[PDB]
Structure formats: structure tokens, C-alpha cells
Amino acid sequence: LSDEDFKAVFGLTRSAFANLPLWKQQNLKKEKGLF
Numbered sequence: 001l002s003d004e005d006f007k008a009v010f011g012l013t014r015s016a017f018a019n020l021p022l023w024k025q026q027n028l029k030k031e032k033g034l035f
Contacts, residue, residue, distance in 0.1 A: 001014075009032050009034055010028050010032060010034075
């Protein structure tokens with residue numbers, strides 16, 4: 001996934017996503033249905 005597309009899906013770019021707590025990342029993954 002391109003960073004822009006990732007930001008489209010999750011709201012944040014991969015780097016900023018990885019910066020987040022793992023439970024929050026997982027929550028986001030499950031929220032958008034994209035792991």
C-alpha cells in the first residue's frame with residue numbers, strides 16, 4: 001500500500017501508524033477491516 005492510500009484508509013501514514021501503540025494499530029486494522 002502506498003503511504004497516501006494507507007493514510008486514506010487509516011488516516012495516518014505508515015510511519016505515524018507504527019508510532020501508535022500496537023493495540024491501537026490492531027484496533028484500526030480491525031476497524032477498517034484491513035490488517
